[PDB]
Amino acid sequence: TVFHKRYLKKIRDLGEGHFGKVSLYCYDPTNDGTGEMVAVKALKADCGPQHRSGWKQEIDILRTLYHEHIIKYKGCCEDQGEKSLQLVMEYVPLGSLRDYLPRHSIGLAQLLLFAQQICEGMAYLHAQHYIHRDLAARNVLLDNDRLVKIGDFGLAKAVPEYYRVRDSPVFWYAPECLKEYKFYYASDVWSFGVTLYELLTHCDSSQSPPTKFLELIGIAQGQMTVLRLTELLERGERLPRPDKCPCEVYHLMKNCWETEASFRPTFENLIPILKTVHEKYQ
Numbered sequence: 401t402v403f404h405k406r407y408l409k410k411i412r413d414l415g416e417g418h419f420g421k422v423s424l425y426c427y428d429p430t431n432d433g434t435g436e437m438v439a440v441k442a443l444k445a446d447c448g449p450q451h452r453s454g455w456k457q458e459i460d461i462l463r464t465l466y467h468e469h470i471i472k473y474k475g476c477c478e479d480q481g482e483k484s485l486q487l488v489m490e491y492v493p494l495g496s497l498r499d500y501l502p503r504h505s506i507g508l509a510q511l512l513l514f515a516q517q518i519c520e521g522m523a524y525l526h527a528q529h530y531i532h533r534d535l536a537a538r539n540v541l542l543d544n545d546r547l548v549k550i551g552d553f554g555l556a557k558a559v560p561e562y563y564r565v566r567d568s569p570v571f572w573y574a575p576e577c578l579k580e581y582k583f584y585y586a587s588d589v590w591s592f593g594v595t596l597y598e599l600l601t602h603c604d605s606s607q608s609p610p611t612k613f614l615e616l617i618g619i620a621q622g623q624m625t626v627l628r629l630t631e632l633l634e635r636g637e638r639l640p641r642p643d644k645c646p647c648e649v650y651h652l653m654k655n656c657w658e659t660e661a662s663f664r665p666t667f668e669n670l671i672p673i674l675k676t677v678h679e680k681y682q
């Protein structure tokens with residue numbers, strides 16, 4: 401589907417993804433005001449050719465992906481201004497779990513439903529032979545109080561086992577990513593582990609992974625932030641058990657954070673486990 405630039409009316413900026421801005425538009429060809437609300441992702445204007453090929457990549461991936469827990473592609477817009485296309489997606493007014501959970505007291509049962517729905521979307525992603533490479537609470541969007549959608553695919557890549565990585569969300573990344581720059585399907589499950597930690601802290605800034613890891617590492621030697629983080633993880637140190645997180649849910653987090661990638665469960669493994677744990681608490 402092709403949106404006509406001349407019927408896009410901007411309302412507000414929504415945020416910054418990996419290649420450029422997400423803005424809320426009304427698409428109102430009738431001119432009455434009852435037209436659809438749409439989220440439009442655009443390439444930054446002065447972006448160089450490493451970003452542009454990246455952006456063409458993000459466009460290609462979202463156009464192929466169809467799942468109840470991935471953000472709906474609607475179409476593209478001819479952006480004369482940036483001599484490229486704008487990605488047109490469904491609008492989700494509640495935004496990310498990073499924005500939502502700090503203002504809404506959510507129950508444990510509802511957080512594990514979110515966790516389950518994230519695993520179902522990633523299993524789909526993995527079955528289509530893509531890696532996300534930025535699975536974090538900022539990238540998980542809330543459609544409604546019982547329904548999340550993986551929302552941003554700017555770092556996502558087609559696997560021809562693993563893709564060789566070249567900015568980076570290091571505080572969400574497995575030891576093999578940091579040390580060997582190799583991103584495996586199992587590296588996304590590490591990231592899921594940190595996302596699950598984020599949900600159980602209600603994305604409290606002061607309990608965030610950057611904050612918690614730099615508390616362990618310090619900032620007196622900023623140049624070796626990845627080295628010290630790598631050494632800390634290989635020593636087996638981990639983000640703490642969130643307040644009021646059940647012991648077995650923390651065991652599941654630590655399992656997603658196995659140093660050995662091959663010892664981590666797949667998203668396929670996690671779906672039946674998260675269902676059963678959800679139903680226990682609900």
Ligand SMILES: CCNC(=O)Cc1ccc(Nc2nc(-c3c(F)cccc3F)nc3c2C(=O)N=C3)cc1
Pocket residue numbers: 412413414415416417422439471489490491492493494495496499538539540541551552
């Ligand atoms: C300043 C106004 N802001 C808000 O009231 C909070 C808010 C922010 C953003 C949204 N929506 C969205 N946010 C992303 C998004 C992302 F997934 C990752 C990084 C940055 C982003 F903006 N993506 C999409 C949508 C959306 O509706 N459709 C796709 C909804 C509410």
